[PDB]
């Protein structure tokens, strides 16, 4: 559907190496996905996809994204950075 802007964080250590991204109510409902869910994500480098999982509570209504260093790295984007997210 359409593309959100969302500001990517690092994963917390308990999901580091899962293929995941971490996304709230709000962002998954705005892109119209669901947990499970193929998201594509765009940064310097090439686009890549990752699944979508619940937020935590600790990070509802804050506008980011959590994925772990070697999709960030993938992406050519920093911890803290905006990115745009497609479903
Ligand atoms: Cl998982
Ligand atoms: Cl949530
Ligand atoms: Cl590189």
Do not use: F, Q, W
Not at 22 to 38: C, H, N, Q
């Amino acid at each position: 559907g359409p593309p959100i802007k969302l500001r990517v964080m690092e994963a917390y250590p308990e999901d580091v190496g899962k293929g995941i991204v971490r996304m709230d109510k709000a962002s998954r409902d705005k892109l119209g996905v669901s947990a499970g869910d193929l998201v594509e994500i765009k940064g310097s480098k090439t686009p890549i996809k990752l699944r979508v999982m619940e937020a935590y509570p600790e990070d509802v209504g804050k506008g980011i994204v959590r994925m772990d260093k070697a999709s960030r790295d993938k992406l050519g984007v920093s911890a803290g950075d905006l990115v745009e997210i497609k479903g």
